[PDB]
Amino acid sequence: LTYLLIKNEEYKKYQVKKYNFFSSGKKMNKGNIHLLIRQMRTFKDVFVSLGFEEMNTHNYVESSFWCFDALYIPQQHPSRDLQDTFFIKVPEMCQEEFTDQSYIENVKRVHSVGDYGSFGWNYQWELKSTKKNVLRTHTTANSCRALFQLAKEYQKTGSIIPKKFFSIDRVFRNENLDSTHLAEFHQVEGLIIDRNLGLSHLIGTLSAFYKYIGISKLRFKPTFNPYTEPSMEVYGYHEENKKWLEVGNSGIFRPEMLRAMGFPPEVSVIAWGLSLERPTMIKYSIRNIRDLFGYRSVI
Amino acid sequence: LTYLLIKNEEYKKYQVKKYNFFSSGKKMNKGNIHLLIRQMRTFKDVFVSLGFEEMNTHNYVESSFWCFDALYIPQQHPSRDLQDTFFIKVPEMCQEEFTDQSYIENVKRVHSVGDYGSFGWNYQWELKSTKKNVLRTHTTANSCRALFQLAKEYQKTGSIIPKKFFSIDRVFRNENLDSTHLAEFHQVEGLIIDRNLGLSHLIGTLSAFYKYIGISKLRFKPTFNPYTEPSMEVYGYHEENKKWLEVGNSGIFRPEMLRAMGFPPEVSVIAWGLSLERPTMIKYSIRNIRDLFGYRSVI
Amino acid sequence: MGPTISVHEEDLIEKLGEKIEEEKLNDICFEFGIEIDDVEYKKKIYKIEVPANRYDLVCVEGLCRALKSFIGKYENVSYALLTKEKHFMRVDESVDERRSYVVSAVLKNVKMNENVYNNIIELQEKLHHNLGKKRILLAIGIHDYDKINFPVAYKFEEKEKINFIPLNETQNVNGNNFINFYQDNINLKSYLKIISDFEKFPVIVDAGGQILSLPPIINCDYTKITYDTRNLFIECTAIDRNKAEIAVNIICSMLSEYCTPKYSIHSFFVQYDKNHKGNGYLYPVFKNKTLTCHMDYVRKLSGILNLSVKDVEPLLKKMMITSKVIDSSTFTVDVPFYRSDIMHFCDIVEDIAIAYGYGNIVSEKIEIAKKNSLSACTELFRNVLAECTYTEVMTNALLSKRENYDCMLRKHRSYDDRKINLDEYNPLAPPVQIMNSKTSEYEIVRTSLIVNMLKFVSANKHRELPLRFFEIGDVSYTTYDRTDTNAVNKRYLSVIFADKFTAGLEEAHGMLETVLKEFQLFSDYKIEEKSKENVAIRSDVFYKLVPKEDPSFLNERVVDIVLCPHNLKFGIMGIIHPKVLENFSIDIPVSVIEINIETIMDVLMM
Amino acid sequence: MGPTISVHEEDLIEKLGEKIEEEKLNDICFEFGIEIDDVEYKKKIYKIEVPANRYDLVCVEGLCRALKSFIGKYENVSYALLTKEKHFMRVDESVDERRSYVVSAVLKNVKMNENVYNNIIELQEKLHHNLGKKRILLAIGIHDYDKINFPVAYKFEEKEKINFIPLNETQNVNGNNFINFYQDNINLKSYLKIISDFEKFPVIVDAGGQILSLPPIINCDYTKITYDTRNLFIECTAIDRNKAEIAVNIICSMLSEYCTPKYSIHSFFVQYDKNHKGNGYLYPVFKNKTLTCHMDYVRKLSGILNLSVKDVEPLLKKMMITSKVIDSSTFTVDVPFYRSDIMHFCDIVEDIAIAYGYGNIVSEKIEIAKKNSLSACTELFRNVLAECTYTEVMTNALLSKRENYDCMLRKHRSYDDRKINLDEYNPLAPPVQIMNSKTSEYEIVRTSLIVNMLKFVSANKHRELPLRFFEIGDVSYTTYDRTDTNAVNKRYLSVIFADKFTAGLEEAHGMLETVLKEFQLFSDYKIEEKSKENVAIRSDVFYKLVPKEDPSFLNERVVDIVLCPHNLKFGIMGIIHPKVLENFSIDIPVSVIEINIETIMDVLMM
Ligand SMILES: COC[C@@H]1[C@H](c2ccc(C#Cc3ccccc3)cc2)[C@@H]2CN(C(=O)Nc3ccc(OC4CC4)cc3)C[C@@H](O)[C@@H](O)CN12
Ligand SMILES: COC[C@@H]1[C@H](c2ccc(C#Cc3ccccc3)cc2)[C@@H]2CN(C(=O)Nc3ccc(OC4CC4)cc3)C[C@@H](O)[C@@H](O)CN12
Ligand SMILES: [Mg+2]
Ligand SMILES: [Mg+2]
């Protein structure tokens, strides 16, 4: 059947039954990084490879100032409505005198009466709404925090140092319980800050990024984002399967967003974002979302 | 003692002996990446982070042309002597018409009668010795292969594209069996190729590299290498311990090496190299080499 | 995201000019920013989606001319804001701040139809739902002009004085039975109870006391919209003055073209009472804003490379913008009131980019650093074995001919052997031999990993069992006339198991299966088994276990692992022979797997 | 690497000029390229190491003036190559190609000493050993001038005609007993049998038939080197003409300074016979090569930034080079025959860099991208758990107050609680509460991972046991007046074990120990145990297991994990209470570990 501690110098006089190798062996138990975390690593590898620095996104609660108002999204936008957003109840409002009053002033000014060459939005901005805590709808929020801190530090330093930032983290949407979409999901964001950038640079780093995951051909559709003009939906051709897919969204951040921060018109930021879940369930051929993540996600 | 499948709705009427938590638990068995491979990963992470591309070093046999003659090391150098080098016996010689006869011609010309502004070595070069296979003494060999291929391709293209290369791989020395040093060890090499480089750039990327492993202060000693003029021994200050250490070697490759390849004097290459073993046994406080690697290397 | 327009398919008119069909309409919308969502009959309606911010694309008419200009012609549109004396409206102290503003408009001498009537109400619902955000910020009402005795007013009146015959009914409805009346209207219960729960109710009413409308969609039945309505009066009541402005400008703008003095709407004035504001507003406004850009910004942002202002004037025309040149380094655009979405020079740049075509901006071409794949593959192998609690090992690349062959009870292949395939696993290939080892035990480079871990196991047989090691590294052998050095390296993985009571012919087998399964490469047995359970396994390539004998392995217990359909031997796995356990001083049974991870690499999935 | 010079310590002379002592000599050598290897008496010899390629630094005299110039003075050296008529040497048809060349030199009127004599022979051995590569390419011989009747010759003579009294003996030695005679000389057996095994033996011999030397170190005893040797003749016989040239130039160069007409050696001519070559050579050669550099190369290569040729002339002087300016964009250096190591403009650049000081080139300052540490730490935790065969899990961040508290048999802390420490593990901290979940079960953000994996275990209790999961992710809770949002996130890790017959109070404990051990953070029990075995464990910080009770854990079987000396609770571990296994529909025992990996992060070692 099988050798033993005793059967050396005495194994010759016995029967070695056939072993049916047309079979499987003993089942082995082994540990597993979650599929979603493997996807997250691969993306993070791509990002560190292109020289990018991870941003801090260690938070789920966000004030609407960072999530909406500092991105130059108006307060009467469907993204700021209860139906589509988890608003926070008990820690309902953030601290007064969050960030800097000068920045808050710039944001109110541009939102209401225009500034920086922009016409504005021609409503009257309310500080009261800006302080309502939500579960962040995107990590674009933390990117805006980071953009503001590097504005505030380069105003003191006087120097505009080019930089590259990425984040991968969970965000929340008040979708239904009938699995139309997901209540939670992870978002991948990257951006670059320097002097005089534009869609040529976006398409460069975009095709870089995306070939790095096996999509050599890209196409670009104009679409709308309130924080990014111009903006383009990104499609890419999946080699191993038949068709083109929607793989990302991106654009150039608006002047009202950045210049409110302190940046001069020289400075521009290019940014893009995409899901983690969709790559995952495509690569591993996962049918529906609830077989990956959540309490009923075995194997 | 411990709960059971039967003791839910019937656990209340029993004795729960004390558990001595002032103890260790069940010993767990777990798998291990080799310490040397962990060190190798960390270095490789540092390298991919600075944008570097791994070279091919998939070989242990090297012709002396690539190991010695193309690096502009003379044939009557102590590195090419039996005492310090494993020469190959059965596959003793490589193929005639290895690489290109023009390159071989350039190397003989510079070694013997000088060229490219160099005086040369004023001996008479022998094609016979250049074809003797060895176990490679360094991976500088494969770096020279790669430098030659990018020369040969940029001559056709006409364009000098800046690039960065690293390798981590085993090399061999005919040291003794009395553990003076090691017969085998892994070498880490990096280099950069572009226009008009020099020691300022070397010290830049060097302090980059080395802070990335927790050595913020560097010092530099002139020393000698036959393939690198100028060249500097690199010392770095180890924070967590008392003293400065020798941590690397480096310099700028000689014109006789590169220009023989095809490069114009515009092109220069900066390069550095270091051990894998020494970081490993410092980080993990390994006493002597034979407790890490080799047949008697448990734990 | 985005609002889905339901337009027709008979839809395609002259307006289109070409009646170009689906396939080039598709690259036209892609190049423009629209996705054609669906087509579905009731025959063959086209539901499309448009930007949420270009409210001048929420009706078929606003699309028609936009997409028309996108290629066809600018067709510099004509307006005519006549008139203030015969037709006005006033806003009462009553109006307050719960719903402050009203904006009115008079489209005189209007063409009438019954599916142009469908057109109108589709437009009204669209602006109600998105811009007006389900009527929460504005409500629009369409009244026949002629049935409303001017002037008109907008107040918050006591509900007991409110009585009118809504569009729904023939029977009057008092204010104080109003909510209760529509409380269960499927279409309107929504709006009703929330929007309005004031002490007084908001009404727009003519000088004849005739209630004409409210916040809740009901309006009087008397000013109904029906064909043979010669001309129209529109009111829009709202909490935001500006968005109501934009609302009515869109409405009268977009059906001016289909009233018989085409592209002409008559105008109204709204004068608030002393207490509220106190001011007034002359609708329609219709101001252009005429921002002027600088020539460096537009190409640096748009990444348009080399092009100048003589190339710009045609580009905006395709987006329905009017354009003229000031200077090589200056522009002069006027925003159409159309484009409420333009707040900055960058919105013009966006439109110029779209007019240019997102497929025609030349890329930065950012040079990336490729990554060696062999390293990649072996690191995945390392991880998958560490996760089964195997410990990695690293041995000497040099050994003695005595260790590799004699103790292994075998002899190496000939140096003139021509059956040797460089893609296969070649443990007894002819070795690389050293001339001058200064250490006697260093005769050759290893050609198999198994010997060194046999040494290792012997080293640690005292330790705690089972022993579960693996090594993964380079082998070398002689290849005359096939490499430039006549030698080659290969990358092997060996997995050794040892235990007092068993050689794991079951666990090594399972380990090989598990390791390869990680890369979606399966046994043939596995593929048969799971397809009898009617499951689709990766079948196009696989591996099999071929029983053979081997000097170094206990008989009937060693196997070649063979890649199919290539038919290439790439590993071995079995029990180690007791004699060679003696030779290597090993007093416990031992099982082994070795594979050449370079054979299978290209079929592995990672 | 490198050759170790053994110089004295009384050594320090005037030559030095300052007699500066060890500490600044050290930064001088570091700045120069030398490492001071050791000091050891016989009193206090200084053994140093010098570049292998600057053969003009292999004797004390060559160092002295080099390091002297390095700071002190250039001291532009003087030569004087007199004379060809009275003192020559000829090379025979015999000489062949096994050892072809000889180079001779005559240092006339020389100072003599007995430790200058030590100096000489130390020099001779050094050049023999490294440049000459253990005499395999050149052999040097020092003969008193006067005892050699000129002219002299170099031949391959029949061994039966070779007879002379070597330095060793007083008794003659024939050629055909030569090897056998020295075959067991400790110092020389090496050289002998290998170098020379020709039919004839190579001798240098004067016109009086007197054998003076050979390849094997023995020379005639008659021309010994001993004090009161007025002046010296040197021969150097070698297979490479050039390296012999460089050899003797070094020798007579470096002791010219200590013959009384200082810095002057007399010269010789060597005329090969018709058959061999046929040519001749006038030693010493002593040519300067005078390469001239261009001003862009030197700063682009040396990275010297802004500096011009007026700054260059002083810099080379410190290296003992002579320097003059041609032009703002041109140089004129002459190589001293000294510097045999200079083949290219870059060797001058190297020396200019050294003269500049490697500590004084301003760095590129290449801006690197820092990396988040929390990600780093959690990925290490992931790997160390995967390697024990635990499977990673990812749950919902939102749940119900009913799941977190009631089913867990507990209530959360107060919103006015001021004992709450943000660095600790705070499972019942006051939660973050949602206003409008559109899904009833989403009342709060989770504050502990344990509940969701209790749900998970319930989900998979049908699956194969044991279950070994872990999750590692963010928790949130309310922190009024302590963050800018009044909420905070923490990063927790929870490890759940479940099995039919046991709650693993032993395996969870071992898992915690193993996981923390990976980061060299140990139990206090561990530290006691392994220090009783007299082992040094990381002791400066550690953790302990504090028994407490918990509503949700079976009594006497749950523990606080506490970081010391900080005294901060950072996890919990124990058996789950049967009642809450009922509440969560779990019919098998379950054990748990949860820790806040942000408390221990800064003491973890990675
Ligand atoms: C609201 O839901 C949006 C979600 C999610 C998404 C979309 C956009 C962003 C963004 C952004 C952004 C834009 C500008 C600046 C900053 C951030 C983030 C997430 C995915 C984004 N999408 C997405 O990930 N799809 C995708 C992405 C990559 C990919 O890789 C190839 C397989 C190898 C494959 C698929 C696109 C679609 O899946 C889309 O259906 C759904 N999108
Ligand atoms: C022949 O043996 C040389 C070996 C090995 C080495 C040295 C130089 C090179 C090189 C090179 C080179 C130079 C120029 C161009 C290309 C390659 C390669 C290996 C280590 C190189 N050395 C070495 O690794 N030491 C070292 C390096 C890094 C390090 O990191 C800090 C702990 C965190 C710590 C120690 C230096 C010394 O250990 C030295 O004693 C031994 N050197
Ligand atoms: Mg737009
Ligand atoms: Mg030098």
Numbering used by the authors:
A (entry chain A), B (entry chain A): 271 to 569
C (entry chain B), D (entry chain B): 0 to 41, 44 to 84, 92 to 284, 288 to 617
Original authors' sentences:
Aminoacyl-tRNA synthetases (aaRSs) activate amino acids as aminoacyl adenylates (AA-AMP), and enable their relay to the 3′-ends of cognate tRNAs as feed for ribosomes. In both P. falciparum and P. vivax, FRSs exist as heterodimers of alpha (α) and beta (β) subunits that further dimerize to form a complex of (αβ)24. Recently, a series of small molecules based on a bicyclic azetidine core have been discovered that exhibit multistage antimalarial activity and can achieve single-dose cures in a mouse model of malaria. It was demonstrated that these compounds exert their antimalarial activity via inhibition of Plasmodium falciparum cytosolic phenylalanyl-tRNA synthetase (cFRS), an enzyme essential for protein synthesis. In this work, we reveal the biochemical and structural basis of inhibition of Plasmodium cFRS via the x-ray co-crystal structure of PvcFRS with BRD1389, a potent antimalarial from the bicyclic azetidine chemical series.
Toward unravelling the structural basis of the protein–inhibitor interaction, we crystallized the PvcFRS-BRD1389 complex and obtained crystals that diffracted to 3 Å. The PvcFRS-BRD1389 crystals belong to orthorhombic space group P21212 with one heterodimer (αβ) per asymmetric unit. Our final PvcFRS-BRD1389 atomic model contains 905 residues- 299:α subunit, 606:β subunit, one Mg2+, and one ligand (BRD1389). The N-terminal domain (residues 1–270) of the α subunit was absent in the crystal and no electron density was observed for it. Further analysis of the PvcFRS:BRD1389 complex revealed that the diarylacetylene moiety of BRD1389 occupies the L-Phe site, its 4-cyclopropoxy phenyl resides in an auxiliary pocket, and the [6.2.0]-diazabicyclodecane group skirts the ATP site in PvcFRS. The diarylacetylene moiety of BRD1389 that occupies the L-Phe site is recognized via a bed of β-strand residues Ala541-Trp542-Gly543-Leu544, while its edge phenyl ring is covered by Tyr497 where it provides an aromatic T-shaped π…π interaction at a distance of ~4.2 Å. The urea/groove interactions are mainly stabilized by hydrophobic contacts, particularly from Pro549 and His508 while residues Val517, Ile483 and Pro549 provide sandwich support to the cyclopropoxy moiety. In this complex, open and close conformation for residue Arg548 is noticeable. In particular, the flexing of Arg548 likely opens the entry point of auxiliary pocket for 4-cyclopropoxyphenyl accommodation, underscoring the induced-fit nature of BRD1389 interaction with PvcFRS. Additionally, in the PvcFRS:BRD1389 complex there are two noticeable, ordered loop conformations in proximity to BRD1389 binding site within the PA1 domain: (1) a left-hand outward displacement (open conformation) of residues 443–453 (loop 1, in ATP binding pocket), and (2) a left-hand inward movement (closed) of residues 507–515 (loop 2, in auxiliary pocket).
